[PDB]
Design a protein around this ligand. Structure first.
Ligand SMILES: O=C(O)[C@H]1O[C@H](OP(=O)(O)OP(=O)(O)OC[C@H]2O[C@@H](n3ccc(=O)[nH]c3=O)[C@H](O)[C@@H]2O)[C@H](O)[C@@H](O)[C@@H]1O
Ligand SMILES: O=C(O)[C@H]1O[C@H](OP(=O)(O)OP(=O)(O)OC[C@H]2O[C@@H](n3ccc(=O)[nH]c3=O)[C@H](O)[C@@H]2O)[C@H](O)[C@@H](O)[C@@H]1O
Ligand SMILES: O=C(O)[C@H]1O[C@H](OP(=O)(O)OP(=O)(O)OC[C@H]2O[C@@H](n3ccc(=O)[nH]c3=O)[C@H](O)[C@@H]2O)[C@H](O)[C@@H](O)[C@@H]1O
Ligand SMILES: O=c1ccn([C@@H]2O[C@H](COP(=O)(O)OP(=O)(O)O)[C@@H](O)[C@H]2O)c(=O)[nH]1
Ligand SMILES: [Mn+2]
Ligand SMILES: [Mn+2]
Ligand SMILES: [Mn+2]
Ligand SMILES: [Mn+2]
Lengths: 580, 601
């Protein structure tokens, strides 16, 4: 009835359960032996990357240049009103300076409408006063909340709630915008509301200028001298973030614009960031994982007028550095999330879930979906993991494997997701191995190992099928994405999730949808154990789905070819490309 | 030398509107045309053995009772998902009443409730220093201040502003002169926590706080319930209170939005996404209240007056400046206020009274006839919304060459997704209240709509009215007088598809249902009307007002199997009514057979 060694240690470290130095390390010792076995390497062979009979004129649409290739995103297609831009200006009483920015906003040269919401975070100076001073020159609104500390996040969310248009832009009160600021944003958002926009900043002393100066001389901003925005170099070197895999690191909250639909898809600014900051990188980290893009805007230049690291807990993707077990403590947002789709898995679920909790990597969680199990899977799940801090389940009506998967994956909170079916089990270092490949090529959408075939009793049946080198062309020919697969949250959110209509091939289908968004990496080691177990019509629909899935992949705009069967023999998966 | 026209009625309304001009000759031509084109009358079918309820109908079987009203929030409550009761965002529209606003805020300081609430003061460009008031209360209330420039009477705009800024899932609206009693917040949230599909209306009292200040109120939080009532512009009273008790707090009221006073209400914020926001077109004349309430109504929301959410209307400054609502709502609230008019006077309305929906798929040679039959109705206050299920023929082009600019016809084309899908899409397109069905290959009689309408008026509780029809060849050839079941009964319908064409229903009743079934290749109509039969009372009209075209001769065996399948399914699905002690099975398993038998479980 006990819980895994790791989770127990982590709780103790965080001092939430008492454990004397003798038990603490008797449990640590136990955790070490249980995760000591390493993975056995599978066997390789002289394989050729691209299949031999791969159509000589057929060309798979190129992948993106990086996880953040908005250009690549642009040329992607399939299957809408630009009313204006809502400009939220978080302000903590820097009156005269605010007026200056406001002034610079009156001189905007754009074709789009734009309102201005001054977000006063309980200023002591009378800010309302200077806003009225502009009521005629601007479609300006005024918003204020009481003073209860450094509530930068709270105010940004108030102003954002107040915003009336489908597009918003955040701009600190000290950030004077150039004359083509508004225009440079709307110009881009209009083309793709799927990419967040970042504006560079410069530095200037506005001390020798009142707001009156900027109003009559609508260009004085592009003149005053000046310290360089550390990001600017990083910008041109990565073709305006187009080649960045960590774009949220450059998402400064003083000047950015994006489609308001992202607030609801990814959430708002974390109001917990009171004594910290990095809420930008955290907010943008969430946009990132939810499929949002980032592009740095040249014309979005603004001037920062001079004034008169627990991301560790919320951003696993790039910041969080691995910690030792004796130091390890649970994280608010875990790094790894193993999703499990369970149905009638009474006798195997525990071994399954435990094989996951007992991993080299303890910074993870397990999310399960009870797909209307008929046996007492749910009861086992309840008396074993109900009050467990690293395991979460949710029940529903049996809607099939695809549906169970989606529910399973939307439940995940981590960045790296792993698939573990309720009847199979992992090796104590599978997550770690895949993690290593991910940390090595931050462009990767998926990394998969191989496996071995197991008996429903445990007995060894045989080593699993193993195709040594991955290639998009080999996957589009045969399911070579052996199990255990571990795919990035972001990549998944760039696809249509799992197919809830097919009765099988649900996996071949997913990794097919994922093989379009990014580069996969294969590891030739056995880190998974898959169990194997009276129809001839059910096998009919089985070879149907295998084929259906491969051509649904046509969602790559390919019509000149059809991945057709070489025979109508159930068990056979031989193919042939027929022209049209 | 040929040409193409647009129906007479529509040509005539645009003329009577001075939006278009016709010479007397041409106009008289079109009027008399309309006069004859709509002179016919539906022929009444003949009744048969009046057998109310099926004898084979179980003796231990009772269907859950229908609501005692379109607004029976009690009936709504009992029915077959946890929400997050976070807080209550009170939006207070304000304009130059600093001292009066102060008292309001003070009373909001005296709230005895177990729920978290925020106060958003929405200032409609007041000159008085409203901000100073807010700041003077930040250490007592979780208050926010939202302000917009002065550009005339912008009540609706300032309400919306505050609402967009509201952080909770629940919102309230209290005019700055409405000093709430101490139980105000609690009396609302208590109810909102139980059912968020019902808006709440609070009563008001008239008193003068003239010789008082906000501190007098923070000092003794009962003073508000002690200030004597006064006579406003024996004292004045909320004209709605004798109505709240006469209809079990609106529970028995059929036109509940008439009491939705924007000065003291509360409701889930989700409704703003469903019914919309406050129409910023309204003026200092008023009306926005009811019209918003009216939309809330057509989308499914229920109304309930709350005795515990009473507020006190503080007499205005005094330095302050010193009839019929039908006129104001007329154009935008068709439901109750709208009344018919004759052709030579009739004019187009902002929100049509009737919306005829059409699910069209490869109906190239019938579509125009179809649409024109709806446009040539005795009832001219009507519109047609068509959804083309991505047809293969030239349907879309016809729609375009014929109605792309029609003021009373609207359409949208998607990719084929079945009849069920197109029905939803077409209904979602409708903007009227009373909506009728018209399949693209059929067509109506010139008095169909009206007849149905006359029944709706007579009984505002009805969810649907339907007539009987006749069968047509693929060219207008009379085949036979379609099936007709004399009297309606929920029991009979659950036993047999007795809801024949033409069917009309309330946009609301439809919104109280779950829409059309998009996973069944057929039996869609049975399903839908079955979904409505559980929501309200039907009324059958024994007259042939619809012409049904029989084309299926081509019925590829298996397709006839599923058509049998789904038929059973629909009735089964009607299980969502709680009924578990029974089943509705196919007596014989002969394809075209429809006989049944109830089996126990
Ligand atoms: O380069 C960065 O990493 C940071 O630059 C800016 O911030 P910064 O110029 O460093 O700080 P301030 O200008 O002093 O404050 C930022 C904003 O917080 C607001 N603020 C400050 C204090 C307060 O109590 N409430 C409040 O809303 C100010 O109005 C201002 O708009 C951005 O606001 C940060 O989000 C960003 O992370
Ligand atoms: O073609 C597919 O969809 C599947 O092919 C193989 O899976 P396989 O072992 O053949 O099939 P199962 O083990 O029965 O199904 C995979 C998972 O779905 C769950 N499942 C299955 C059936 C069901 O109705 N509901 C449900 O949740 C199972 O418990 C299991 O965890 C792959 O290993 C799966 O990951 C992939 O989803
Ligand atoms: O069981 C049903 O759901 C239908 O049965 C009969 O309809 P029927 O004449 O048999 O079928 P159709 O005439 O082929 O289709 C009904 C309407 O849906 C449209 N439709 C049909 C097929 C489709 O894929 N999409 C689509 O929009 C058609 O144009 C037509 O107006 C009834 O007369 C219909 O009122 C009812 O909707
Ligand atoms: O230009 C205006 C005038 C009034 N109001 C608000 O509209 C509501 C109704 O005003 P009033 O009390 O005069 O309405 P009555 O009591 O006459 O119905 C109050 O919340 C006012 O603060 C407003 O927002 N803008
Ligand atoms: Mn700054
Ligand atoms: Mn399995
Ligand atoms: Mn008033
Ligand atoms: Mn038909």
């Amino acid at each position: 009835i006990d819980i895994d060694a790791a989770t127990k240690i982590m709780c103790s470290n965080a001092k939430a359960i008492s454990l004397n130095e003798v038990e603490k390390n008797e449990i640590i010792s136990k955790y070490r032996e249980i995760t000591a076995k390493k993975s056995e390497r599978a066997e390789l062979k002289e394989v050729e990357p691209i299949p031999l009979d791969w159509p000589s004129d057929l060309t798979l649409p190129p992948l993106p240049e990086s996880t953040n290739d908005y250009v690549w995103a642009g040329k992607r297609k399939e299957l809408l009103i630009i009313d204006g831009l809502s400009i939220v200006i978080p302000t903590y009483n820097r009156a005269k300076i605010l007026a200056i920015t406001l002034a610079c906003l009156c001189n905007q040269k754009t074709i789009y409408d734009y309102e201005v919401i001054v977000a006063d975070d309980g200023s002591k100076e009378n800010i309302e006063e200077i806003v009225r001073e502009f009521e005629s020159l601007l479609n300006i609104k005024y918003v204020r909340q009481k003073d209860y500390g450094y509530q930068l996040c709270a105010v940004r969310n108030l102003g954002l709630r107040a915003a009336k248009y489908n597009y918003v832009a955040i701009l600190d009160c000290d950030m004077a915008p150039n004359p083509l600021w508004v225009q440079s944003y709307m110009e881009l958002l209009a083309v793709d509301d799927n990419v967040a926009l970042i504006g560079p900043r410069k530095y200037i002393d506005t001390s020798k200028h009142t707001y009156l100066d900027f109003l009559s001389q609508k260009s004085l901003i592009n003149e005053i001298p000046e310290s360089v925005d550390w990001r600017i170099e990083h910008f041109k070197n990565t073709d305006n973030l187009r080649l960045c895999n960590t774009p949220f690191r450059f998402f400064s909250g003083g000047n950015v614009a994006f489609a308001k639909k992202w607030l609801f898809r990814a959430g708002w600014f974390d109001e917990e960031f009171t004594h910290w900051g990095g809420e930008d990188n955290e907010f943008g980290y969430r946009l990132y994982r939810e499929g949002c893009y980032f592009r740095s805007v040249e014309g979005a230049m603004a001037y920062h007028q001079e004034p008169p690291q627990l991301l560790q807990q919320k951003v696993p993707y790039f910041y969080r550095k691995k910690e030792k077990i004796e130091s390890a403590t649970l994280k608010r947002v875990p790094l790894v999330s193993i999703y499990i789709p369970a149905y009638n898995c009474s006798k195997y679920i525990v071994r399954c879930v435990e094989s996951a909790l007992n991993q080299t990597i303890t910074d993870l969680e397990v999310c399960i979906c009870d797909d209307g199990s008929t046996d007492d899977t749910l009861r086992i799940l309840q008396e074993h993991y109900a009050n467990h801090p690293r395991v979460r389940f949710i029940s529903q009506k049996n809607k099939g494997i695809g549906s169970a998967s989606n529910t399973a994956v939307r439940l995940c909170r981590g960045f790296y997701i792993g698939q573990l079916d309720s009847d199979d089990f992992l090796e104590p270092d599978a997550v770690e191995l895949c993690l290593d490949e991910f940390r090595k090529d931050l462009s990767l959408a998926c990394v998969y190992t191989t496996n071995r075939n197991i008996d429903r009793e445990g007995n060894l049946i045989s080593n699993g099928y193993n195709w040594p080198i991955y290639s998009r062309e080999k996957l589009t020919s045969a399911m070579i994405c052996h199990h255990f697969r571990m795919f990035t949250a972001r990549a998944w959110n760039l696809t249509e999730g799992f197919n809830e209509s097919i009765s099988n091939a649900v996996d071949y289908d997913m990794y097919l949808k994922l093989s379009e968004v990014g580069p996969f990496k294969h590891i030739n080691k056995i880190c998974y154990n898959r169990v194997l177990h009276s129809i001839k019509k059910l096998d009919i629909q089985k070879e149907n789905h295998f084929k259906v899935v491969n051509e649904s992949l046509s969602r790559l705009g390919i019509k000149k070819y059809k991945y057709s069967p070489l025979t109508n023999l159930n068990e056979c998966r031989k193919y042939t490309w027929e022209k049209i």
